[PDB]
Ligand binder design. Structure first.
Ligand SMILES: CC/C(=C(\c1ccccc1)c1ccc(/C=C/C(=O)O)cc1)c1ccccc1
Ligand SMILES: CC/C(=C(\c1ccccc1)c1ccc(/C=C/C(=O)O)cc1)c1ccccc1
Lengths: 235, 236
């Protein structure tokens, strides 16, 4: 299974799991903008499910746990992927090949400019660090597995083994990240520094997800179960 | 000067800067619980200010930048401390020597138990990894310098060499963390595996903080600017 994979074997697995890139429904008040984004998120979300299944180790976990991971990670994963796509588009966000939005077009939705700025800062940092695809894909898997691991129900011998498994795979991806960096020619010190630099960014992506989530939660009718909830429901 | 400190000099400066340990002012109910915690936290924030000035690097930043860092980090920093002190107290959170609360006492205030459970879990994880104080004091400093760095207003030339500076100091603290692990005799693999492990926990701490601010914001009427806000505005 996933624990005996080599670093090359893991990068491959991860690159192959990558889901196709989605298009938007076509390029401006609050409702029209939130509709595009909401539509794109939901389709990305449906793709995210079969991606997660292709991630080494994810499928060894019980369903309710798989679902908990996605519940906790889905907006982060959407965001890192956006930030990655927007890397070579300074001051802009590439939601889709046909939806490239301005810093300013965030102002279309009271609340969203704060969030656009954070995404722009994140992708700017990735550009400075010259983040690579092999690393991007690794980060994305770390988010999937780490964002929900501290919030299970650890009262049980089975939730212990679940946590233990996830942490073992997380170690394997760390091993993989270092492996990529050693191959790229960085020194030990540079390796350790880049590892840290990248994992600290994951803290900011968490922050952004929390904020996006809080904004989502305050915009919606409270009598409404949003589509992310339902999908994880029917799972 | 911070950029030329060695790993041993770094650990030292940090152990040296640790603020005293605070006692609860008093010794259930919903408002009585929040009273304890709020005062404890406010008193801890005050001590946090002088602590932060002693973190190598911090004082080289402009004032406005110092205040920003503290604004983004103060709840994470309290929380990691609580988690750290509660390590050898399973199922409990040691807010102070005279205030040891129980997982169950979290339901004393609505929504809190969610947060207590996350805290207990974090401290519980630290206990398996056997976190050391040298490590702790590094993580605490990483939260201070990192939590507000991706969220600086300006695009000026100075703003750039200001976060350049922060990232240099962060790199030095990564160096110190590893140095520590290597002295404890871990393998290279074990070393980088542990660094990742600790920094991934910092993601969870950020999350607990974000949750903490939401519960806070929702319990208090909007007519009120809270004491942490007042204090930071003034430090500026
Ligand atoms: C930052 C963009 C964004 C997303 C989004 C992120 C990446 C890719 C596409 C969209 C977003 C907005 C609404 C939703 C709604 C989901 C749902 O209603 O089920 C999901 C994500 C968002 C999230 C919250 C508030 C404003 C915008
Ligand atoms: C989890 C405990 C806690 C803190 C706290 C944490 C560790 C040590 C001391 C306090 C907390 C509670 C209230 C405040 C209030 C601050 C203020 O009013 O300015 C700050 C922190 C808290 C935070 C949010 C909601 C409920 C409790």
């Amino acid at each position: 299974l996933a624990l005996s994979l080599t670093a090359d074997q893991m990068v491959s697995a991860l690159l192959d799991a990558e889901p196709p890139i989605l298009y938007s429904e076509y390029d401006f008040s609050e409702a029209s903008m939130m509709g595009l984004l909401t539509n794109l998120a939901d389709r990305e979300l449906v793709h995210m499910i079969n991606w997660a299944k292709r991630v080494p180790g994810f499928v060894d976990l019980t369903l309710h746990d798989q679902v908990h991971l996605l519940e906790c990670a889905w907006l982060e994963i959407l965001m890192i992927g956006l930030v990655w796509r927007s890397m070579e588009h300074p001051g802009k966000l590439l939601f889709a090949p046909n939806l490239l939005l301005d810093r300013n077009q965030g102002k279309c939705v009271e609340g969203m400019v704060e969030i656009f700025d954070m995404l722009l800062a994140t992708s700017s940092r990735f550009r400075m660090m010259n983040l690579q695809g092999e690393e991007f894909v690794c980060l994305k898997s770390i988010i999937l597995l780490n964002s929900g691991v501290y919030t299970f129900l650890s009262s049980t011998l089975k939730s212990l083994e679940e946590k233990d498994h996830i942490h073992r795979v997380l170690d394997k991806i760390t091993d993989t990240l270092i492996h990529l960096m050693a191959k790229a020619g960085l020194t030990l010190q540079q390796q350790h520094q880049r590892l840290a630099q990248l994992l600290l960014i994951l803290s900011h992506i968490r922050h952004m997800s929390n904020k996006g989530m809080e904004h989502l939660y305050s915009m919606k009718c409270k009598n409404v179960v949003p589509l992310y909830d339902l999908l994880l429901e029917m799972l």
